[PDB]
Design a binder for this molecule. Structure first.
Ligand SMILES: N[C@@H](Cc1c[nH]c2ccccc12)C(=O)O
Ligand SMILES: N[C@@H](Cc1c[nH]c2ccccc12)C(=O)O
Lengths: 381, 379
């Protein structure tokens, strides 16, 4: 919350009622897939879950399940922090090889921000290109805009209504903190976000089928929506969706805040130039190192609060190379200046690569991803 | 019953006077409908705008709806539809009829399927009133919301401009109601704007809307009129109807959940006769002597009120009003008259409802272009 080393996610798990992703669960995931678990799991980035056990049972018993995650398109400007969940979702889809549903809440943002319907919709379609740039299989993923899809689904709105009937205003005032002063749109929005947790909201993909297990990978701050969804699921004859939580991507200023596009000073946008990335890291990445280089060589740095090192934790694939850096920074063998330099050498190509991928997705490609249709996945209807 | 003059002032609407009725006559070339001549449709909002438009040859459309609470519809439910069908013929305009299955699902102990099915059934009776299938689109919220490129978009726009406080004070909602109810008002509001029916008005957003309804639906539209400007749409005009009397009296409340509360559209010749005689509150005197001397009271006699809604011939209605008030006519003879009017009415409606085939209902509920052409150009 205010700790320089970030939030206490063990306390968070507790006051959230979720369960920790332990060694046991990570080994099971490895066993079930025969693949080495993604570094987000190995390193505690995706630290919490809800019913991942069930998802695994289903997967091992050849039962089907699908992925569902989303994005609030509040702007054309996305940052590196926004990529975490998507990066992991793309891994989950390749590893388990299941269909994916990605909700673009353009209506949410229209409701909450000073935006035009076309703006909101435009940001959804633009952000979709960035999501497509993460590598999702065009034949296994449906990226939809709430504004468009609501009007071209024989089952989506039906579920929204079912959910709306089972969630009182008091409940959402408690869960999300709404007040008598908010517009009725905001008050009923949670149902829109919950609805995609149920397979029959996507007839063109699951056609009336209502049992497919849903797995929702998302940043921990989205949990309240699905904590609510899980309570209503049984009440309306549907299965509870499973969750896989991720920690907040640290703001440049320090781990006590998540990177927020609101404050561009804390973000590294996917549209920043190599130069801008370098100067943002060098000038703004909070350092766990010592004040003078002499003191650094003598006492060493503190990785637990160093933002530059935390970023490496998310983007440096190689486990061994990261460890050297950790040890060398801690022993003072590596100066924060060199740590910084190392991070910049990881992000510049990360972001430049992403821009290259994004430039590749043409109007025709986006349109297809956003067209409801069968996802070359056969279900025992 | 209720003093509708004090209602007009409270609600801040306008009384339908003779000028307005004469104007409607001139604009339509028809004799104004008896509901109009007899004050059944007594209040309005902007009806003059609608007339200015029609006179200047601009277009306008009709919007009304039905809450499918049950498969059981009674004579009082037809009032706004009988009138609306008249307005459609007389002005010759496209009509949109909203079946709020979602509202009933939210408010009642029903399943989505039931609410929906009730909407389809009720739609049969609505079609039985004789609406032109080339000029009217009847839709289920549950279905249309899911296949319209403009309906949901308008709901969201409306939802952004109405706070919980607002609907709390208007509909009396509480922190305890479900979130579906808190936002439903926006759904009843949406069809007030033409671009909610892109298929029928070719994406026009400036088409004048006329909403004929029972005075108790006004709140939904006072709200709608309030937001219309805030989202660049013209506000809808209204024509209010009085409450239909409950058999037990113009004081008590009626319901589809009370077979003797009114005369249901499925009743037999015998049941109609039985109901009127046994349950129609009488404005007659306690004894025949008092009746002959001081006469009956038509202002509290439910049977007479009924005749006011269904007896077409003005002169005969007056002869009965006169004879009952003079005591010349006993309440038993009055009852007799009402029954001769109601039996053929329900009988005929039941006959036309049987002519409503599943494909007819489907065509009516199928979003499509109606037999009207609207142009919209922009480069
Ligand atoms: N509401 C989230 C986006 C979202 C919608 N559905 C989701 C499911 C999983 C994760 C995120 C989402 C936001 O504002 O960012
Ligand atoms: N809500 C009204 C039905 C309705 C919906 N839209 C309307 C428009 C005009 C008049 C009535 C309606 C009811 O419960 O009966």
């Amino acid at each position: 919350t205010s700790s320089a080393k970030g939030i206490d996610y063990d306390k968070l798990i507790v006051r959230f009622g979720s369960s920790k992703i332990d060694k046991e669960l990570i080994n099971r995931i490895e066993r079930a897939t025969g693949q080495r678990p993604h570094h987000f799991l190995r390193r505690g980035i995706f630290f919490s879950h809800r019913d991942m056990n069930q998802v695994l049972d289903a997967y091992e018993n050849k039962k089907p399940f699908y992925l569902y995650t989303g994005r609030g398109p509040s702007s054309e400007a996305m940052h590196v922090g926004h990529l975490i969940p998507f990066i992991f979702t793309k891994w989950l889809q390749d590893v388990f090889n299941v269909p994916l549903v990605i909700q673009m809440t353009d209506d949410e943002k229209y409701l909450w921000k000073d935006l035009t319907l076309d703006q909101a919709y435009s940001y959804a379609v633009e952000n979709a290109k960035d999501i497509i740039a993460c590598g999702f299989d065009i034949n296994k993923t449906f990226i939809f805009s709430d504004l468009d899809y609501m009007g071209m689904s024989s089952g989506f709105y039906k579920n929204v209504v079912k959910i709306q009937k089972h969630v009182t205003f008091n409940q959402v005032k408690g869960i999300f903190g709404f007040t008598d002063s908010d517009c009725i749109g905001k008050i009923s929005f949670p149902a829109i976000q919950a609805a995609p947790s149920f397979s029959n909201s996507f007839p063109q993909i699951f056609r009336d089928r209502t049992d497919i297990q849903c797995l929702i990978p998302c940043a921990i701050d989205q949990d309240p929506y699905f904590r609510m969804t899980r309570d209503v699921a049984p009440r309306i004859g549907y299965p509870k969706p499973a969750l896989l939580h991720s920690t907040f991507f640290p703001a440049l200023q320090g781990a006590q805040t998540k990177m927020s596009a609101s404050d561009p000073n804390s973000s590294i946008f996917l549209t920043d130039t190599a130069k801008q990335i370098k100067t943002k890291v060098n000038k703004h990445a909070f350092s766990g190192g010592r004040d003078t280089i002499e003191e650094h060589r003598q006492f060493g740095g503190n990785c637990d609060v160093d933002v530059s090192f935390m970023y490496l934790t998310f983007f440096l694939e190689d486990d061994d190379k990261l460890e050297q850096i950790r040890k060398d920074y801690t022993s003072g063998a590596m100066l924060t200046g060199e740590l910084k330099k190392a991070l910049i050498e990881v992000l510049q190509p990360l972001i430049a690569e992403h821009q290259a991928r994004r430039k590749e997705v043409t109007d025709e490609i986006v349109k297809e991803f956003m067209t409801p249709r069968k996802l070359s996945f056969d279900f025992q209807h």
